[PDB]
Amino acid sequence: RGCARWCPQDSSCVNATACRCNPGFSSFSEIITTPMETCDDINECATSCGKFSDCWNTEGSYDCVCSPGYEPVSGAKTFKNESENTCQDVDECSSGQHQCDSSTVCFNTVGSYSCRCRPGWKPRHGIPNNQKDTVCE
Numbered sequence: 001r002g003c004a005r006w007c008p009q010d011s012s013c014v015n016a017t018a019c020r021c022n023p024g025f026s027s028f029s030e031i032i033t034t035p036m037e038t039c040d041d042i043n044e045c046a047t048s049c050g051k052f053s054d055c056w057n058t059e060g061s062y063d064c065v066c067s068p069g070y071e072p073v074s075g076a077k078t079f080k081n082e083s084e085n086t087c088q089d090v091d092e093c094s095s096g097q098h099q100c101d102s103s104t105v106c107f108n109t110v111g112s113y114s115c116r117c118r119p120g121w122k123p124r125h126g127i128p129n130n131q132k133d134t135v136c137e
């Protein structure tokens with residue numbers, strides 16, 4: 001029809017005297033009729049991203065991301081639903097991404113990894129075996 005100039009932040013005119021929140025935002029009424037009304041971000045993460053992932057809420061949207069220790073097989077850094085989820089555990093030992101001390105051997109775990117002595121070396125004082133910072137002698 002026409003276009004109200006006074007639409008509040010995150011809403012768009014639907015005609016000369018009314019607005020509607022943009023996708024991803026909500027207001028008390030389905031149709032906004034005054035500039036005092038507000039369009040608040042909807043937290044999609046509190047309403048499924050699938051395995052090994054986290055949901056991060058944003059303004060007007062949200063993103064699923066593989067959790068730390070996992071990475072998408074498909075390469076996509078962000079996704080929207082379980083159907084697009086390609087997160088798999090990162091094998092830090094095979095990939096050489098681990099930061100183990102030359103005195104230990106990397107041992108892959110799901111979501112993480114650790115470093116162990118060689119089971120003839122022994123851990124230096126104050127540091128347990130089977131940790132990322134393990135150092136032996």
Ligand SMILES: C[As](C)(=O)[O-]
Nearest residue numbers: 049051052053054
């Ligand atoms: C693997 As999840 C989306 O429950 O943090």
Ligand SMILES: [Ba+2]
Nearest residue numbers: 042058060061
């Ligand atoms: Ba949002």
Ligand SMILES: [Ba+2]
Nearest residue numbers: 090109111112
């Ligand atoms: Ba792992």
